[PDB]
Structure formats: C-alpha cells, structure tokens
Amino acid sequence: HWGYGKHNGPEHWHKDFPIAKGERQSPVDIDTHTAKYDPSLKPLSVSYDQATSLRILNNGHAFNVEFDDSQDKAVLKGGPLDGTYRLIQFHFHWGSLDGQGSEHTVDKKKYAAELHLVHWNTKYGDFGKAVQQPDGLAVLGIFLKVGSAKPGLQKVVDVLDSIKTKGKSADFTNFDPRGLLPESLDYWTYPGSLTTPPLLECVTWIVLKEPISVSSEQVLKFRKLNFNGEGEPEELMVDNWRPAQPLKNRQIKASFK
Ligand SMILES: N#CC1(c2ccccc2)CCN(C(=S)S)CC1
Ligand SMILES: [Zn+2]
Predict the structure, then answer these.
(1) Site annotated as Fine-tunes the proton-transfer properties of H-64: where?
(2) Best CA proximity match to 143, nearest among 89, 187, 200
C-alpha cells in the first residue's frame, strides 16, 4: 500500500494512481516573483466561530482532527472561491528535521510543517461527491516554522500520546481552529490536487503567506507518532510530505502586492 517509505513513497504512487503525473498536481513551488497580484480576488472569509470538532484519528499517514460538517458551522468563502465550503477536517504534513516537512515551498524554501484545513463545496452535498469535481475542495494551507510555541496548538499536541498508532482515535471536542491561524490572511492561490492518494484534481489551494510559529517541543511530539499499528515494529511518523510537482499550465495568483 502507498506510504512515504523508499518502496512505497511518492515516486511509486503513479503506478496505482496514474493521475500522479496529471496536469494539475500538488504541491508546487510558489515562485514569489512570478506569482501575479490579482486585484479582483476578494478577501478571504474564514468563519470558524461555530466549529464543532469531534474526534482525532491516526489514519496511518497523518492525524486528522475531524469536525461536524452536517451543517454550515465552520465555513470558508470569498477569495478565489464561488460559494460556500464547509470545514471537514484538518491535518498536518511534517518532517524528521526542522528544515523539511512542508509540501508547498516558497522560492524553494521548505518549512518544518504544513497545516491543511480541508473544506468541501456544499453545492455537491457530500465530501465524496465533492472530490470528484474540479472545484470540489478548498484547502487552506498554512506553513509552520519552529520558534515560539503556538498556544492554540497545544491541545492537539497533548492528545497525540493517546493516538500513537495507526487506527487509534480519541474524542476531541470543543477545539477551536481559530487558534491555528496567523494574523494575516494574505495568500497565494492556484488550482491543484490532493497531495496524497487518490491525488484527485479537485482542490482550489489557498496558501497563506504568513507562517505560524510552533515550538521545537511541539513539533517533536508530532514526530513521536507512529505510521504502524499497535503491536508492530515502530516506524516514526515523519516526512509524510509529497515534494513539489510540475506547475505545468498554471499561474499562481497573489491576493497581495
Ligand atoms: N484524509 C484525507 C484526504 C482524502 C483521503 C481519501 C479520499 C479523499 C481525500 C483528504 C485531505 N487530504 C489532503 S488535503 S492532503 C488527505 C487526503
Ligand atoms: Zn494534506
């Protein structure tokens, strides 16, 4: 099965998922000097005050913080987006070392990790339908750098011991994802894909320019998770990122000058 090892990693994925070599794959390098300011882009609207988190799951490739998406409770709109996109979950991609871990890069710079807040277009009724559409998802990508602690991340860090291995989940109610956002909502946007199999080309990417800072202790706790199941040889959950893919026939737009 696919993963991030030498024998089943990103360079292998195309064999089971031929779309891996498609025309709008993610992540990509964001060349800041080539991205064009688009004055017609609207400001983002991130409405998370009514978010209802439910559970945290180690799915064997990352951990997902899941939300109740059966009503418009936490939504993303505006920016490049037409309509309303509901928050379903967030997860991260991170490295074994502070110098790698992000999927998107900025002028080839890699960050220590990258947060993906995943939202689906409500005009498609459910997430499974939405991923089959070119405008089905909007993913808000936020870079993490190591420095000062992010206080709003700590509740996530502290539950990881309870979901160390693949398939473990834990109750995770009343978590406020507003505590994971940087001050500025300036962003780059482009059409792309999921960055894990099934690699579906259904994502409007919205990548924030301003990283959040997390502490070395916080990211060290991510790196204590396991890709393996309980009672299996330990394989640390690290370097669960896909490298940058060809930009092909796409332009990255900036919301800012
Ligand atoms: N979990 C999960 C994802 C998934 C998994 C199976 C089918 C469709 C989507 C959605 C969010 N993902 C990205 S934003 S990288 C990871 C893959
Ligand atoms: Zn992701």
Answers:
(1) 4, 59, 64
(2) 187
> What whole-number distance in Å separates Cα of residue 196 and Cα of residue 161?
24
Q: Mapping DSSP to helix (H, G, I), strand (E, B) and coil, where does residue 5 land?
A: coil
Please tell me the total count of domains within the chain: 1
Identify which of 58, 118, 199, 241 to mutate to test ligand 1's pocket (most ligand atoms within 8 A of the CB): 118
Ligand 1 site, CB within 6 A: 64, 116, 118, 131, 139, 194-196, 198
Measured in whole angstroms, how far is the alpha carbon of residue 40 from the centre of its chain? Answer: 25
Q: How far is the CA of 247 from the centre of ligand 1 (A)?
A: 21
Which structural domain range is residue 166 located in? 1-257
Tell me the CA–centroid distance for residue 196 and ligand 2, in Å.
7
Q: Which structure tokens are listed for 192?
A: 């792309």
Q: What's CA 200's distance to the chain center, in Å?
A: 14
Q: How far is CA 153 from CA 67, 87, 142, in A?
A: 16, 18, 13
Tokens at 109, concatenated: 């710079």
Residue 61 bears catalytic tag: yes
* Ligand 1 atom 1, closest CA: 64
- Ligand 1 atom showing the smallest separation from residue 116 Cα: 14
Q: Where are the beta strands (DSSP E) in 25-72?
A: 29-30, 36-37, 44-47, 53-58, 63-67
Binding region: 91, 93, 116, 195-196
**Residue 61 sits in a domain of what CATH number?**
3.10.200.10
Q: Rounded CA gap, 67 and 48, in Å?
A: 11
Q: Which helix (H) or strand (E) holds 206?
A: strand 203-208
Q: What is the dihedral of CA 125, 129, 134, 136, to 10 degrees?
A: 40
Q: Can you give the resolution of this entry in Å?
A: 1.5
